[PDB]
Amino acid sequence: EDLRLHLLLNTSVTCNDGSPAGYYLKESRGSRRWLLFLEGGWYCFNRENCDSRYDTMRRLMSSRDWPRTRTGTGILSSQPEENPYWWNANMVFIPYCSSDVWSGASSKSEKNEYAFMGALIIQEVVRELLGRGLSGAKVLLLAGSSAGGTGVLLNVDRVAEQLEKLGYPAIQVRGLADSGWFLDNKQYRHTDCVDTITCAPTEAIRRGIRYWNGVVPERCRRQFQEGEEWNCFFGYKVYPTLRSPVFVVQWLFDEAQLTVDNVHLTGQPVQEGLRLYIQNLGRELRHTLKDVPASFAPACLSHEIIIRSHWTDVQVKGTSLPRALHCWDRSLHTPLKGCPVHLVDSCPWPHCNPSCPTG
Numbered sequence: 001e002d003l004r005l006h007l008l009l010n011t012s013v014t015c016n017d018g019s020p021a022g023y024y025l026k027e028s029r030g031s032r033r034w035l036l037f038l039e040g041g042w043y044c045f046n047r048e049n050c051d052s053r054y055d056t057m058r059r060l061m062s063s064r065d066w067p068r069t070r071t072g073t074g075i076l077s078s079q080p081e082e083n084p085y086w087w088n089a090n091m092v093f094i095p096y097c098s099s100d101v102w103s104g105a106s107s108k109s110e111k112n113e114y115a116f117m118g119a120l121i122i123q124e125v126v127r128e129l130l131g132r133g134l135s136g137a138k139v140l141l142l143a144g145s146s147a148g149g150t151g152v153l154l155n156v157d158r159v160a161e162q163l164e165k166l167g168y169p170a171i172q173v174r175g176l177a178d179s180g181w182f183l184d185n186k187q188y189r190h191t192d193c194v195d196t197i198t199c200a201p202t203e204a205i206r207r208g209i210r211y212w213n214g215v216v217p218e219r220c221r222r223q224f225q226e227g228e229e230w231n232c233f234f235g236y237k238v239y240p241t242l243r244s245p246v247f248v249v250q251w252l253f254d255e256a257q258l259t260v261d262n263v264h265l266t267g268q269p270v271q272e273g274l275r276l277y278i279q280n281l282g283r284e285l286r287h288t289l290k291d292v293p294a295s296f297a298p299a300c301l302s303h304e305i306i307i308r309s310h311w312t313d314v315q316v317k318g319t320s321l322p323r324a325l326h327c328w329d330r331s332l333h334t335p336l337k338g339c340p341v342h343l344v345d346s347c348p349w350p351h352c353n354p355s356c357p358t359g
C-alpha cells in the first residue's frame with residue numbers, strides 16, 4: 001500500500017547531479033523477508049549522452065522531482081492476487097539515478113561533471129535499512145530489471161559481503177536478475193557507437209565501465225584482469241563467479257538486446273538473413289542458460305517483466321514465474337518433485353510460447 005520515499009541520510013551518496021539518492025520503503029513487520037528492487041533505464045557512457053539524458057530523463061539522474069510515495073506493482077505488490085510469491089514481504093524500491101548500471105563506486109571528483117555512485121547507493125540503502133528492521137531479516141532478495149537486473153549480478157555478492165563484514169551473517173542474500181542477461185554479440189547491421197540505444201553491447205560497456213569507473217565482482221575481475229572488466233557486465237561471464245544464489249529471468253528475445261543489435265521488427269516481412277540472426281540469438285541465449293539451475297527464459301519478444309502488474313500470466317512448460325520462484329525458495333531451505341526451477345523455452349521464434357505477453 002504505497003512505499004514511502006526516504007532520501008539517504010549520508011548526504012555524500014548522490015544521484016548523477018549531486019542530489020541525494022534514496023529508496024522507497026513499505027514495511028511488513030510480521031515478515032522477515034526483504035525485497036530490494038533495483039530500477040532500470042539504460043545508462044549513459046559519455047558526457048554528451050549524459051548531458052542529453054539530463055534534458056530528457058532528468059529523474060534518472062536526480063532526486064529533486066521524485067514523488068514522496070510510489071505504488072508497489074508486480075513482485076513489489078502486497079496484494080496476493082497480483083503477487084502470489086512474496087506479497088507479505090518488506091518492500092524496497094531503489095530508484096536508478098546514477099546511469100551506471102549500478103557499478104559506480106567513486107565519489108565524484110570536481111574534475112568530472114556527474115557522480116556515478118550506483119554501487120555505493122545500494123550499500124548505503126542496505127546500511128540505513130539495518131536500523132529499520134533489515135537487521136532482523138532472514139532473507140534479503142536483491143532484485144532488479146534491465147539495467148537493474150545487470151546491477152543485481154554486479155552487486156549481489158558485495159551486499160552479502162557487506163552484511164557479513166557488518167556482523168549479520170544470518171541474513172541470506174539472494175539475487176533475482178530480470179532482463180539483465182545480455183550477449184556481447186555482433187549486431188545484425190553495423191552501427192557507429194554514437195548513442196545509448198544503438199551502440200553495440202560490447203563497445204557500450206567498454207566505454208561505460210571506464211566512464212563510470214565501474215566496479216565488478218572480485219572473482220570475475222581477477223579472471224579478466226586489468227582493462228577487460230567490461231566482460232563482467234555480461235551475465236554468462238560473471239554469473240559462474242558469483243557465490244550468492246541468483247535466479248535469472250530473461251526473455252530469449254529481449255527487446256533491449258535486439259535494439260543494441262540493431263534489429264527492428266515492425267511486422268514487415270523478415271528475410272532469411274534476419275530470421276537466421278534472430279533464431280541464432282535465441283539459441284545462443286538458451287545456451288548460456290543451460291548451467292543456470294534457477295532460471296525462467298520464455299521465448300518472447302518483450303521488455304522486462306517482474307514489476308509489471310500481469311507478471312503472473314507467462315508460463316514456461318506449464319509453470320509461472322511466481323511458482324518457479326517459490327520452488328527456488330524451497331530449494332534453498334536436489335531437484336524437487338512437482339516444483340521446477342529450471343524453465344528455459346526451447347522453441348526457436350518470438351511468441352512460439354503461446355503465453356507470451358501480447359501488449
Ligand SMILES: *[C@@H]1O[C@H](CO)[C@@H](O)[C@H](O)[C@H]1NC(C)=O
Pocket residue numbers: 010012013107
Ligand atoms: C558516508 O558516505 C561516504 C561515501 O562518500 C563513506 O565513505 C562514509 O564512510 C559514510 N559514513 C557515514 C557515517 O555515513
Ligand SMILES: Cc1cc(C(=O)O)c(C)n1C1CC1
Pocket residue numbers: 040041042043101146147148150182183201204205233256257260
Ligand atoms: C548492461 C546493459 C543494460 C542494458 C539495458 O537495456 O538496460 C543494456 C542493453 N545493457 C548492455 C547491452 C548489455
